[PDB]
Amino acid sequence: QGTGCSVEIINSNQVSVGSGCARINSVTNIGDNQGRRWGVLANSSCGLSTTQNLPSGWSLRQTGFCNA
Amino acid sequence: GTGCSVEIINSNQVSVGSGCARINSVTNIGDNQGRRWGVLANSSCGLSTTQNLPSGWSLRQTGFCNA
């Protein structure tokens, strides 16, 4: 297994605009392609959320375990 | 969809790096050991590297991305 969850930030056209390894039980700083920085929370099930609301129609996706 | 989302996968099937590989280009993607890998991507999101990956490692495409 991994110390984190691989995260993609998905825009409203279902295209990824940023990615990184979100450490489990932490907030990880992950950017999008507009330069915005997101604080991504991850839990041990690789459920994911952000400290601020994503843009309307955007989403987060976890693609598997990662090591940061 | 200017690129392919790429993950670098180690020999235990854990991701050790990710990024957006521009289609029909080489894009450097880092791993978690501070190394850079030059990833080729095509319009079907086939992926390869300009240097040999560590034994047991592989690349995974996870859809389209915009750089």
Short mmCIF file of all heavy atoms in Angstrom, two decimals, chain B residues 4 6 8 21 25-27 29 37-42 45-53 58-61:
data_model
loop_
_atom_site.label_atom_id
_atom_site.label_comp_id
_atom_site.label_asym_id
_atom_site.label_seq_id
_atom_site.Cartn_x
_atom_site.Cartn_y
_atom_site.Cartn_z
N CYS B 4 -1.82 13.71 -21.81
CA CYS B 4 -2.28 12.50 -21.15
C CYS B 4 -1.83 12.55 -19.70
O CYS B 4 -0.66 12.84 -19.43
CB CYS B 4 -1.64 11.29 -21.81
SG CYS B 4 -2.08 11.11 -23.54
N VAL B 6 -0.38 11.07 -16.60
CA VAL B 6 0.59 9.99 -16.44
C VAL B 6 0.84 9.76 -14.96
O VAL B 6 0.98 10.71 -14.19
CB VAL B 6 1.92 10.33 -17.14
CG1 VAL B 6 2.94 9.21 -16.89
CG2 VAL B 6 1.72 10.53 -18.60
N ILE B 8 3.69 7.28 -12.73
CA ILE B 8 4.83 6.38 -12.73
C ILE B 8 4.59 5.40 -11.60
O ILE B 8 4.38 5.81 -10.46
CB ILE B 8 6.14 7.15 -12.49
CG1 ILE B 8 6.32 8.24 -13.54
CG2 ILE B 8 7.31 6.18 -12.50
CD1 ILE B 8 7.53 9.09 -13.34
N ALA B 21 1.46 14.71 -19.57
CA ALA B 21 2.39 14.52 -20.67
C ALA B 21 1.73 15.04 -21.94
O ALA B 21 0.77 14.45 -22.44
CB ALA B 21 2.79 13.06 -20.82
N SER B 25 4.76 14.80 -27.77
CA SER B 25 5.89 15.52 -27.21
C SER B 25 6.54 14.62 -26.17
O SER B 25 6.04 13.54 -25.84
CB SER B 25 5.43 16.83 -26.57
OG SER B 25 6.55 17.64 -26.28
N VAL B 26 7.65 15.12 -25.64
CA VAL B 26 8.31 14.56 -24.47
C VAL B 26 8.16 15.57 -23.34
O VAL B 26 8.47 16.76 -23.52
CB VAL B 26 9.79 14.26 -24.75
CG1 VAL B 26 10.41 13.62 -23.54
CG2 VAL B 26 9.92 13.36 -25.95
N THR B 27 7.71 15.11 -22.18
CA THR B 27 7.45 15.96 -21.03
C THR B 27 8.15 15.32 -19.85
O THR B 27 7.99 14.12 -19.60
CB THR B 27 5.96 16.06 -20.72
OG1 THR B 27 5.23 16.50 -21.87
CG2 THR B 27 5.70 17.03 -19.59
N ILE B 29 8.55 14.24 -16.19
CA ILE B 29 7.71 13.91 -15.05
C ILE B 29 8.65 13.44 -13.95
O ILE B 29 9.49 12.56 -14.16
CB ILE B 29 6.75 12.75 -15.40
CG1 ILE B 29 5.95 13.06 -16.66
CG2 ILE B 29 5.87 12.41 -14.21
CD1 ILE B 29 4.91 14.08 -16.48
N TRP B 37 11.91 11.92 -15.57
CA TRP B 37 11.70 10.96 -16.64
C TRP B 37 11.05 11.65 -17.81
O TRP B 37 10.01 12.30 -17.66
CB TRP B 37 10.79 9.83 -16.15
CG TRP B 37 11.41 9.11 -15.00
CD1 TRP B 37 11.15 9.28 -13.67
CD2 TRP B 37 12.43 8.10 -15.09
NE1 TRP B 37 11.94 8.42 -12.93
CE2 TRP B 37 12.73 7.70 -13.78
CE3 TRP B 37 13.09 7.50 -16.16
CZ2 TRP B 37 13.68 6.72 -13.51
CZ3 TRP B 37 14.03 6.54 -15.90
CH2 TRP B 37 14.31 6.16 -14.59
N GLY B 38 11.63 11.48 -18.98
CA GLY B 38 11.05 12.09 -20.17
C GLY B 38 10.03 11.19 -20.80
O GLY B 38 10.35 10.15 -21.37
N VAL B 39 8.77 11.58 -20.69
CA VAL B 39 7.65 10.74 -21.09
C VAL B 39 7.18 11.17 -22.47
O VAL B 39 6.81 12.33 -22.67
CB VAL B 39 6.51 10.80 -20.06
CG1 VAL B 39 5.32 10.07 -20.58
CG2 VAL B 39 7.01 10.22 -18.74
N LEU B 40 7.19 10.23 -23.41
CA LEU B 40 6.52 10.39 -24.69
C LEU B 40 5.07 9.99 -24.55
O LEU B 40 4.75 8.96 -23.94
CB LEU B 40 7.14 9.43 -25.70
CG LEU B 40 8.55 9.65 -26.19
CD1 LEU B 40 9.57 9.17 -25.21
CD2 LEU B 40 8.74 8.91 -27.54
N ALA B 41 4.18 10.77 -25.19
CA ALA B 41 2.77 10.44 -25.23
C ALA B 41 2.26 10.59 -26.65
O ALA B 41 2.65 11.53 -27.36
CB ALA B 41 1.94 11.34 -24.32
N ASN B 42 1.36 9.70 -27.06
CA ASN B 42 0.68 9.85 -28.34
C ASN B 42 -0.79 10.16 -28.12
O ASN B 42 -1.28 10.23 -26.99
CB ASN B 42 0.92 8.64 -29.25
CG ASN B 42 0.46 7.34 -28.65
OD1 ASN B 42 -0.61 7.26 -28.09
ND2 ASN B 42 1.28 6.30 -28.79
N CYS B 45 -2.81 8.12 -25.88
CA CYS B 45 -2.27 8.01 -24.53
C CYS B 45 -1.47 6.73 -24.31
O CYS B 45 -1.31 6.27 -23.18
CB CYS B 45 -3.36 8.25 -23.49
SG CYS B 45 -3.84 10.02 -23.50
N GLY B 46 -0.89 6.20 -25.37
CA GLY B 46 0.27 5.36 -25.20
C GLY B 46 1.41 6.19 -24.65
O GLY B 46 1.58 7.36 -25.00
N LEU B 47 2.20 5.57 -23.76
CA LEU B 47 3.24 6.27 -23.04
C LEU B 47 4.52 5.45 -23.04
O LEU B 47 4.46 4.23 -22.93
CB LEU B 47 2.88 6.50 -21.58
CG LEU B 47 1.59 7.23 -21.30
CD1 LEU B 47 1.23 7.09 -19.82
CD2 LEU B 47 1.70 8.68 -21.71
N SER B 48 5.66 6.12 -23.15
CA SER B 48 6.96 5.47 -22.97
C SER B 48 7.91 6.52 -22.42
O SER B 48 7.54 7.68 -22.26
CB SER B 48 7.46 4.89 -24.28
OG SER B 48 7.66 5.93 -25.22
N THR B 49 9.13 6.12 -22.10
CA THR B 49 10.13 7.04 -21.59
C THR B 49 11.38 7.02 -22.47
O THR B 49 11.71 6.01 -23.10
CB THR B 49 10.55 6.71 -20.14
OG1 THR B 49 10.87 5.32 -20.02
CG2 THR B 49 9.44 7.01 -19.15
N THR B 50 12.09 8.15 -22.48
CA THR B 50 13.32 8.24 -23.26
C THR B 50 14.48 7.48 -22.62
O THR B 50 15.46 7.17 -23.30
CB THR B 50 13.73 9.70 -23.43
OG1 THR B 50 13.98 10.27 -22.14
CG2 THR B 50 12.69 10.51 -24.16
N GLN B 51 14.40 7.21 -21.32
CA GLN B 51 15.38 6.42 -20.61
C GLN B 51 14.69 5.19 -20.06
O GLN B 51 13.49 5.19 -19.81
CB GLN B 51 16.01 7.22 -19.47
CG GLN B 51 16.70 8.51 -19.96
CD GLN B 51 17.90 8.27 -20.86
OE1 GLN B 51 18.49 7.19 -20.88
NE2 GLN B 51 18.28 9.29 -21.63
N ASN B 52 15.46 4.13 -19.83
CA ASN B 52 14.88 2.91 -19.30
C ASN B 52 14.40 3.13 -17.86
O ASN B 52 15.16 3.60 -17.01
CB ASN B 52 15.93 1.80 -19.29
CG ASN B 52 16.09 1.14 -20.63
OD1 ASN B 52 15.34 1.38 -21.55
ND2 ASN B 52 17.11 0.30 -20.75
N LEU B 53 13.16 2.74 -17.59
CA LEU B 53 12.65 2.83 -16.24
C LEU B 53 13.30 1.77 -15.35
O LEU B 53 13.78 0.74 -15.83
CB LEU B 53 11.14 2.60 -16.23
CG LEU B 53 10.24 3.75 -16.67
CD1 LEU B 53 8.82 3.23 -16.82
CD2 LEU B 53 10.30 4.90 -15.69
N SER B 58 6.52 0.90 -14.34
CA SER B 58 5.69 1.05 -15.53
C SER B 58 5.04 2.42 -15.51
O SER B 58 5.12 3.15 -14.53
CB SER B 58 4.63 -0.05 -15.59
OG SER B 58 3.79 0.01 -14.45
N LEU B 59 4.41 2.76 -16.63
CA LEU B 59 3.66 3.99 -16.78
C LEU B 59 2.19 3.63 -16.90
O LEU B 59 1.82 2.61 -17.48
CB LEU B 59 4.08 4.74 -18.04
CG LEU B 59 5.55 5.15 -18.06
CD1 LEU B 59 5.85 5.75 -19.42
CD2 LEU B 59 5.88 6.12 -16.93
N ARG B 60 1.36 4.51 -16.36
CA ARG B 60 -0.08 4.35 -16.40
C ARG B 60 -0.68 5.65 -16.89
O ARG B 60 -0.33 6.72 -16.38
CB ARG B 60 -0.53 4.08 -14.96
CG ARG B 60 -1.97 3.76 -14.75
CD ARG B 60 -2.18 3.43 -13.27
NE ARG B 60 -1.71 2.09 -12.92
CZ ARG B 60 -1.75 1.58 -11.69
NH1 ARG B 60 -2.23 2.32 -10.70
NH2 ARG B 60 -1.34 0.35 -11.44
N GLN B 61 -1.58 5.56 -17.86
CA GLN B 61 -2.31 6.73 -18.32
C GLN B 61 -3.66 6.74 -17.62
O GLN B 61 -4.32 5.70 -17.52
CB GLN B 61 -2.50 6.71 -19.84
CG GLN B 61 -3.48 5.66 -20.38
CD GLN B 61 -4.87 6.20 -20.66
OE1 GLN B 61 -5.17 7.37 -20.46
NE2 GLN B 61 -5.75 5.31 -21.12
#
